[PDB]
Design a binder for this molecule. Structure first.
Ligand SMILES: *[C@@H]1O[C@H](CO)[C@@H](O)[C@H](O)[C@H]1NC(C)=O
Lengths: 49, 50, 28, 99, 49
């Protein structure tokens, strides 16, 4: 149960916005300009790290 | 042609667990999903009109 | 002792222990 | 002053850009764009009973698993293309170079 | 939605966009779209934010 629950929590952490505008990277890439897309991906990267 | 022709009586009843709808238009299967929306509370203080 | 009848060659107590202990694609 | 208040989601929507449409494919790892949602995967047939009002499907992990095409009302399953780790089994380089 | 006609009559003083990159406005699908209109003072355009 501990192993399964830890894996489930790690998977569920992918759905968090982490202060960005969208929790999915593709929409951020296809919706914004690189100078601000870099900031959004920075927030997502630090959260997932 | 406005005429008053209806007389109404009120009773109060318990709603049990009725009044649940699909919150959105996304297909889900074999899950437990938590939503915050406008729902009729369980066992409500409901009004029967006759 | 091991049970030759079972294909897994496990003792009855071992079989009981195996049976008594028990989404994957999403993680994968 | 004139302000425009578009609202964006993972939704089929009604207002769309002037881009042209293209025929679909099956059983092949392709990258697709459906009404603004971009994803790479394999498109397969569906046995899921999609409700008429429903458009997409999500799994336990809240990921897009099935989608209804806007131009033709059909349900298609998204399955990400095959991937996995690679390991190299080798003896000592002193002994040989085969792997 | 084609925003080229928007750039047809284009003596804009300010065309800043917040959540979407203006150059990619033709690459997305939109819903619940509203267009508002009013008139203010020249120095108050910064206040619309
Ligand atoms: C139902 O509602 C009425 C009016 O709000 C209240 O007087 C009555 O006591 C309620 N019934 C119960 C069982 O609480």
């Amino acid at each position: 149960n501990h192993n399964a629950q830890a894996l489930n929590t790690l998977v569920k952490q992918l759905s968090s916005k982490f202060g960005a505008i969208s929790s999915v990277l593709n929409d951020i890439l296809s919706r914004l300009d690189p100078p601000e897309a870099e900031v959004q991906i920075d927030r997502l990267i630090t959260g997932r790290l | 042609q406005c005429v008053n022709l209806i007389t109404r009586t009120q009773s109060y009843t318990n709603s049990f667990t009725r009044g649940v709808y699909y919150p959105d238009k996304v297909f889900r299967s074999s899950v437990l999903h938590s939503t915050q929306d406008l729902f009729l509370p369980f066992f409500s203080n409901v009004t029967w009109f006759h | 002792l091991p049970d030759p009848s079972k294909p897994s060659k496990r003792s009855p107590i071992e079989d009981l222990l195996f049976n008594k202990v028990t989404l994957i694609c999403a993680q994968k | 002053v004139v302000v425009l208040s578009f609202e964006l989601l993972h939704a089929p929507a009604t207002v769309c850009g002037p881009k042209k449409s293209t025929n679909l494919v099956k059983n092949k790892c392709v990258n697709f764009n459906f009404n603004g949602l971009t994803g790479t995967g394999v498109l397969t047939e569906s046995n899921k009973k999609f409700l008429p009002f429903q458009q997409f499907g999500r799994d336990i992990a809240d990921t897009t698993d099935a989608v209804r095409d806007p131009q033709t009302l059909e349900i298609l399953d998204i399955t990400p293309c095959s991937f996995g780790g690679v390991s190299v089994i080798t003896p000592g380089t002193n002994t040989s170079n085969q792997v | 939605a084609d925003y080229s006609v928007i750039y047809n009559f284009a003596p804009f003083f300010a065309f800043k966009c917040y959540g979407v990159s203006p150059t990619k406005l033709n690459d997305l699908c939109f819903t619940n779209v509203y267009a508002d209109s009013f008139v203010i003072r020249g120095n108050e355009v910064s206040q619309i934010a």
